[PDB]
Design a protein around this ligand. Structure first.
Ligand SMILES: *C[C@@](*)(O)[C@H](CCCNC(=N)N)NC(=O)CNC(=O)[C@H](CCC(=O)O)NS(=O)(=O)c1cccc2c(N(C)C)cccc12
Ligand SMILES: *[C@@H]1O[C@H](CO)[C@@H](O)[C@H](O)[C@H]1O
Ligand SMILES: *[C@@H]1O[C@@H](C)[C@@H](O)[C@@H](O)[C@@H]1O
Ligand SMILES: [Ca+2]
Ligand SMILES: [Ca+2]
Ligand SMILES: [Ca+2]
Ligand SMILES: [Ca+2]
Ligand SMILES: [Ca+2]
Ligand SMILES: [Ca+2]
Ligand SMILES: [Ca+2]
Ligand SMILES: [Cl-]
Ligand SMILES: [Cl-]
Ligand SMILES: [Cl-]
Ligand SMILES: [Mg+2]
Ligand SMILES: [Mg+2]
Ligand code: NA
Lengths: 254, 142, 191
């Protein structure tokens, strides 16, 4: 996160830290006691599928306390349409091997229905993005969880304002822009998989996943987030599925 | 207006324009200067655009030049107070007032629903947790 | 479908209507309005009109700056096509309505001319505010008589040659504006 603040411990209680071979990999969002949503691209270079861990209740990566809960990741489910090395369909659903235990420091974010998300949540201007990613583009990651409030744009507005870059990825119906074009504030590398969370009438909902941006807080560019509303039925169906033996499952989308 | 030997009388705004309709020339006979006459004439001949009663639903009309403004009662809006705020209870209008999920039902009233972990209250729109740690709430702040 | 165009704000005494083109053919419209940091509120849902009254939203704060956008939806129904309006700041841009002379009186050697309070669409405490309630010292009235007088209130006190009949017309003015600075002249009234 660039230009954010530290999230007071306990105030981002659905944030997940994913680790691969005990090293920090990406963020994620807890959506009930067993299932986490993150970004597909986080898993492009994984070789040791059996050494993925999700940590809930984390805040300060330099100190341990009794609020952290770690669970092995039993399954990583990615849409079959996702192409490694590219940005479209940038979502993963992770099944934890055992449930985390809900506490004052560990609570899921609500996964909304599609129509509610498209018709109501999409028009709430600001939402929170969070993570332990880079503090500056090409700068060292954060030790304390950081959070940032960002405004959402419809794609037509995002496209016109944005400085043209030759060879850049298309903004598709599966993604939406949010943030600021003036260089001040954005999510960044190492925040991927983390929630874009929207508050509506006293409850918080998952509306985006940190996905891709040109650098981070580049002038003339916004952060781009996976539109989670396009995957509600896909996530719901998969959460009803029976576990497979291998960890990675490519599942058809739609 | 003109009648036998009335034009022997000097002109009178009240007699000729307020109590009767006056022609442009009768008006000019009163004001004399062309510019004074046109300033009078611009409004006098404009017409009362409120005479068609355009403001609906108990609203109030104020005449302007070639135009009017409608002041609506609190339950109406629109140029002519034609839109009934009470007829607007559909999910795209502020989520139908549902706290969480809204479902349209054509002909009959929209209904409101809740995420798992919550249940719908007596009021048909509010949601209440049914579990200790429902999704989307921050325990240390509540 | 085609996006709306020539989005234009029509506003007098805070009654504020957005207008656009074109007439729809197999498409309907919905309007949204917001302030720069606020949430978008929908209005005129699936209308086939090419106007949308936004008075009730903008009178919540007439000094805010509002952005509207008009969505076009294919008849019977990704993100839709849409077009943004110009920004609109009601206190700076609303037209001042045509005023009316309420009365004039000869108080001996002088004539008082009183301008009727000009009602606006801003409500407070369940009643409509006047232009002077909203603008305060930003609003003056000007009187043309037969030459000119100006007032910080709704009344003028002018000197008159006795037994002579005078004619009056008045204009609402916001002297700090450069555009839409003055109303049209009131109807002329005469002694
Ligand atoms: C994996 C996540 O931790 C991280 C989150 C970044 C969120 N960023 C912002 N909110 N600003 N996501 C990624 O690292 C995914 N990759 C990129 O964002 C990528 C980084 C390179 C860069 O130029 O910044 N940028 S990109 O998505 O725009 C992108 C993707 C693919 C190809 C690109 C090229 N080509 C064709 C070589 C050029 C430029 C950007 C490209
Ligand atoms: C008289 O009323 C009609 C509608 O009833 C309106 O269109 C005119 O503008 C008004 O003068
Ligand atoms: C004019 O104003 C409207 C709002 C209503 O109150 C009417 O009763 C009145 O004449
Ligand atoms: Ca820790
Ligand atoms: Ca006569
Ligand atoms: Ca006559
Ligand atoms: Ca005459
Ligand atoms: Ca007569
Ligand atoms: Ca004559
Ligand atoms: Ca008129
Ligand atoms: Cl485990
Ligand atoms: Cl990036
Ligand atoms: Cl006034
Ligand atoms: Mg008389
Ligand atoms: Mg004559
Ligand atoms: Na920027």
């Amino acid at each position: 996160i660039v230009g954010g603040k530290v999230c007071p411990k306990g105030e981002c209680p659905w944030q997940v830290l994913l680790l691969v071979n005990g090293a920090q990999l990406c963020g994620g969002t807890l959506i009930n006691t067993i299932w986490v949503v993150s970004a597909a691209h986080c898993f492009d270079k994984i070789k040791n599928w059996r050494n993925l861990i999700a940590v809930l209740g984390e805040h300060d990566l330099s100190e341990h306390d009794g609020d952290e809960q770690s669970r092995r990741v039993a399954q990583v489910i990615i849409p079959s349409t996702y192409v490694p090395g590219t940005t479209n369909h940038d979502i993963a659903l992770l099944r934890l091997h055992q449930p985390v235990v809900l506490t004052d420091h560990v609570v899921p974010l609500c996964l909304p229905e599609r129509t509610f998300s498209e018709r109501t949540l999409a028009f709430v201007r600001f939402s929170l993005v969070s993570g332990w990613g880079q503090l500056l583009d090409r700068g060292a990651t954060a030790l304390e969880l950081m959070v940032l409030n960002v405004p959402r744009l419809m794609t037509q507005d995002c496209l016109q304002q944005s400085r043209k870059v030759g060879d850049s990825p298309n903004i598709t119906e599966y993604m939406f822009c949010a943030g600021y074009s003036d260089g001040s504030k954005d999510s960044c590398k190492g925040d991927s998989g983390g929630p874009h969370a929207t508050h509506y009438r006293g409850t918080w909902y998952l509306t985006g996943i940190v996905s891709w941006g040109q650098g981070c807080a580049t002038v003339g560019h916004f952060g781009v987030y996976t539109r989670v509303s396009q995957y509600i039925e896909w996530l719901q169906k998969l959460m009803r599925s029976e576990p497979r033996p291998g960890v990675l499952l490519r599942a058809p989308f739609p | 207006a003109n009648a036998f030997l009335e034009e022997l009388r000097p002109g009178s705004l009240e007699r000729e324009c307020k109590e009767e309709q006056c022609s442009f020339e009768e008006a000019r006979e009163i004001f004399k200067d062309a510019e004074r006459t046109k300033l009078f004439w611009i409004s006098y001949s404009d017409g009362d655009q409120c005479a068609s009663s355009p403001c609906q639903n108990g609203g109030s009309c104020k005449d302007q030049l070639q135009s009017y403004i409608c002041f609506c009662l609190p339950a109406f809006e629109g140029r002519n107070c034609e839109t009934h705020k009470d007829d607007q209870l559909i999910c795209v209008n502020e989520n139908g007032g549902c706290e969480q999920y809204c479902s349209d039902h054509t002909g009959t009233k929209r209904s409101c629903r809740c995420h798992e972990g919550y249940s719908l209250l007596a009021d048909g729109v509010s949601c209440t947790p049914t579990v200790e740690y429902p999704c989307g709430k921050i325990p240390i702040l509540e | 479908t085609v996006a709306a165009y020539n989005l234009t704000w029509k506003s007098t005494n805070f009654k504020t209507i957005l207008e656009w083109e074109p007439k729809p053919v197999n498409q309907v419209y919905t309007v949204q309005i917001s302030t720069k940091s606020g949430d978008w509120k929908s209005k005129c849902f699936y209308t086939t009109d090419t106007e949308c009254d936004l008075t009730d939203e903008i009178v919540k704060d007439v000094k805010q700056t509002y952005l509207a956008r008009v969505f076009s939806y294919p008849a019977g129904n990704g993100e839709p096509l849409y077009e943004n309006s110009p920004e609109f700041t009601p206190y700076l841009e609303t037209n001042l309505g045509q005023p009316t002379i309420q009365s004039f009186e000869q108080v001996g050697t002088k004539v008082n001319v009183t301008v009727e309070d000009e009602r606006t669409l801003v409500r407070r405490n369940n009643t409509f505010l006047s232009l002077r309630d909203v603008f305060g010292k930003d609003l003056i009235y000007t009187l043309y008589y037969w030459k000119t007088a100006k007032t910080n209130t709704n009344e003028f006190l002018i000197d008159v040659d006795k037994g002579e009949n005078y004619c009056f017309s008045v204009q609402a003015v916001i002297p700090s504006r450069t555009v839409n600075r003055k109303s049209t002249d009131s109807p002329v009234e005469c002694m």
